Amino acid sequence: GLTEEQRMMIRELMDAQMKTFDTTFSHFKNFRLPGVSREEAAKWSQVRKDLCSLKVSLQLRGEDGSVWNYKPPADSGGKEIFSLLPHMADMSTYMFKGIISFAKVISYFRDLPIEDQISLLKGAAFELCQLRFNTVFNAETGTWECGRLSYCLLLEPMLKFHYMLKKLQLHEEEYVLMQAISLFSPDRPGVLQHRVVDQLQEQFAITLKSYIECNRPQPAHRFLFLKIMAMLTELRSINAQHTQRLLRIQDIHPFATPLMQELFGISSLTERHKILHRLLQE
Amino acid sequence: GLTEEQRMMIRELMDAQMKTFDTTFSHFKNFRLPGVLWSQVRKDLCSLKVSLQLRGEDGSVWNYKPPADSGGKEIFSLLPHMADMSTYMFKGIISFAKVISYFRDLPIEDQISLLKGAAFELCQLRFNTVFNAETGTWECGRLSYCLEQLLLEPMLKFHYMLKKLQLHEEEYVLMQAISLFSPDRPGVLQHRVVDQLQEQFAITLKSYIECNRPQPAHRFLFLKIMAMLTELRSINAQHTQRLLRIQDIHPFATPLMQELFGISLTERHKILHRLLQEGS
Numbered sequence: 001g002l003t004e005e006q007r008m009m010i011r012e013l014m015d016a017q018m019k020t021f022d023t024t025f026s027h028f029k030n031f032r033l034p035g036v037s038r039e040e041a042a043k044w045s046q047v048r049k050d051l052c053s054l055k056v057s058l059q060l061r062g063e064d065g066s067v068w069n070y071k072p073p074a075d076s077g078g079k080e081i082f083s084l085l086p087h088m089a090d091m092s093t094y095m096f097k098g099i100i101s102f103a104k105v106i107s108y109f110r111d112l113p114i115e116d117q118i119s120l121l122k123g124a125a126f127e128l129c130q131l132r133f134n135t136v137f138n139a140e141t142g143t144w145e146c147g148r149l150s151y152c153l154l155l156e157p158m159l160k161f162h163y164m165l166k167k168l169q170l171h172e173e174e175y176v177l178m179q180a181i182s183l184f185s186p187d188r189p190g191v192l193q194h195r196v197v198d199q200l201q202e203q204f205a206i207t208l209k210s211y212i213e214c215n216r217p218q219p220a221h222r223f224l225f226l227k228i229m230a231m232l233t234e235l236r237s238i239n240a241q242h243t244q245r246l247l248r249i250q251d252i253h254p255f256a257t258p259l260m261q262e263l264f265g266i267s268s269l270t271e272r273h274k275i276l277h278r279l280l281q282e
Numbered sequence: 283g284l285t286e287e288q289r290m291m292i293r294e295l296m297d298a299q300m301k302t303f304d305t306t307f308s309h310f311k312n313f314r315l316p317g318v319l320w321s322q323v324r325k326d327l328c329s330l331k332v333s334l335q336l337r338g339e340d341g342s343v344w345n346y347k348p349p350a351d352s353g354g355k356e357i358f359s360l361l362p363h364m365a366d367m368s369t370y371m372f373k374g375i376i377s378f379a380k381v382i383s384y385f386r387d388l389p390i391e392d393q394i395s396l397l398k399g400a401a402f403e404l405c406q407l408r409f410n411t412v413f414n415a416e417t418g419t420w421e422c423g424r425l426s427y428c429l430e431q432l433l434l435e436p437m438l439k440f441h442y443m444l445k446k447l448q449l450h451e452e453e454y455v456l457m458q459a460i461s462l463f464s465p466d467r468p469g470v471l472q473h474r475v476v477d478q479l480q481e482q483f484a485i486t487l488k489s490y491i492e493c494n495r496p497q498p499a500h501r502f503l504f505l506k507i508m509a510m511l512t513e514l515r516s517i518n519a520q521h522t523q524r525l526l527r528i529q530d531i532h533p534f535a536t537p538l539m540q541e542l543f544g545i546s547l548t549e550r551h552k553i554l555h556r557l558l559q560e561g562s
């Protein structure tokens with residue numbers, strides 16, 4: 001079995017998750033919707049690729065039974081494929097806030113210095129959002145099912161990530177431990193208490209390993225923990241790749257919300273991050 | 283061939299049609315849409331259930347599927363939109379009548395009376411020209427209205443039958459003219475001048491058909507069209523009734539619609555009067 005310490009480590013993460021993860025997206029409201037030189041062109045062509053991968057239809061089920069459905073353009077002359085970016089900005093921003101709240105209720109994270117709390121959330125925010133998104137991914141229909149909202153589409157790393165993680169059929173406890181391990185990465189830019197963070201991450205990984213030994217049948221889940229650790233490594237790479245895409249798009253066509261600007265780097269740490277700081281302070 | 287006077291007549295109507303019928307609906311704007319989120323009344327709404335498509339000038343597509351009837355109130359979701367579209371069509375019809383010499387010479391009160399009586403009908407006639415019978419959808423530029431046995435609903439049957447006749451533009455516009463100059467609309471004073479005008483349009487229609495449609499597919503075409511116009515008059519009455527029932531339970535009509543659908547003429551129709559006095 002798990003040590004008492006480990007079971008309560010899990011209890012605390014699971015309670016943090018249930019307090020701060022709106023799984024039906026009921027409180028996602030007031031979001032925007034798609035409306036109803038040589039160097040510059042070199043920037044644009046890189047951005048066109050970046051936005052292609054980024055293609056979903058959007059579905060909108062009302063209470064009455066009505067359904068609105070949005071289908072994105074094909075890429076033409078220019079702007080029309082920035083159509084979804086305001087909506088996406090709002091969805092991510094909503095998801096980030098939940099992730100910030102998640103971090104805050106965790107004693108282990110609270111005790112860290114505010115500046116490290118900021119650095120860790122800057123470093124992991126995208127990864128935890130994707131981990132949460134995976135839990136509402138339906139691999140049969142290639143659809144993220146977010147309450148009344150749906151996003152519908154394997155070489156794109158992000159998409160293959162979600163099919164792959166979904167195949168592992170993780171438990172809630174394993175997802176939330178994944179979130180902890182990603183959140184407490186000692187090797188994020190700007191982290192100071194490297195030693196403390198590392199020991200905390202190791203605690204979580206050990207806890208995750210132990211959970212798997214104890215709760216899943218023997219030889220068949222022999223390597224599950226290492227597979228999960230491999231997924232985290234792949235997610236970390238997707239994070240970096242995705243940040244660079246977002247920064248290129250932002251550069252030519254600004255879309256990021258204030259909070260997103262703080263996270264992606266768009267004086268001091270707390271001063272470059274007044275919103276994040278506020279959100280952590282309350 | 284046609285007399286000179288008839289050629290001229292058709293030319294004026296066709297010119298009028300072209301000037302006042304935006305077939306790409308490019309200037310239909312600022313309409314309401316369903317939010318993103320009694321027994322007789324429910325029967326009405328259900329017969330004429332459509333899904334709505336809007337294509338962006340960029341390639342994008344929004345599609346809206348209506349709720350199944352599960353109780354009430356959700357069955358009214360498309361009404362504000364339908365009212366905006368009908369109001370846009372009616373204004374085009376008003377412009378159409380305005381540019382016709384034979385109409386603008388009538389007393390302002392008859393102009394009002396004829397338009398009250400015919401607007402719905404002319405609107406359906408224009409809608410039929412953008413009706414796709416294969417797909418069951420009215421194709422209005424970037425907007426589309428797709429039907430969700432159905433011929434049982436007189437409105438739907440009308441559009442299918444009329445589409446089947448494969449009329450020319452000339453024939454649609456002569457139908458519009460005949461419907462417009464109905465001497466027996468309520469409140470019409472110069473019923474005699476109107477009747478003579480209607481008779482000349484009907485004669486021109488019959489002559490046009492004889493000078494242009496030899497094929498046995500078109501035998502009796504003129505008489506079918508006139509029969510269709512009588513049927514359209516009956517649908518008009520029916521649909522006006524449906525609308526009052528629905529407006530009673532649940533208001534949705536625009537101010538211009540409330541004017542057209544009733545019930546000193548100029549005083550009770552301030553918007554019409556205004557549009558008629560305005561230059562075309």
Ligand SMILES: O=c1ccn2c(n1)O[C@H](COc1ccc(-c3cccc(C(F)(F)F)c3)cc1)C2
Pocket residue numbers: 054088089091092093126129130133144151158242246260
């Ligand atoms: O916002 C969403 C909506 C759906 N999904 C998701 N994020 O992760 C999966 C793949 O689809 C995506 C579409 C857009 C983004 C996106 C767009 C703009 C900004 C951001 C970010 F969070 F990084 F700021 C993320 C991410 C993923 C599934």
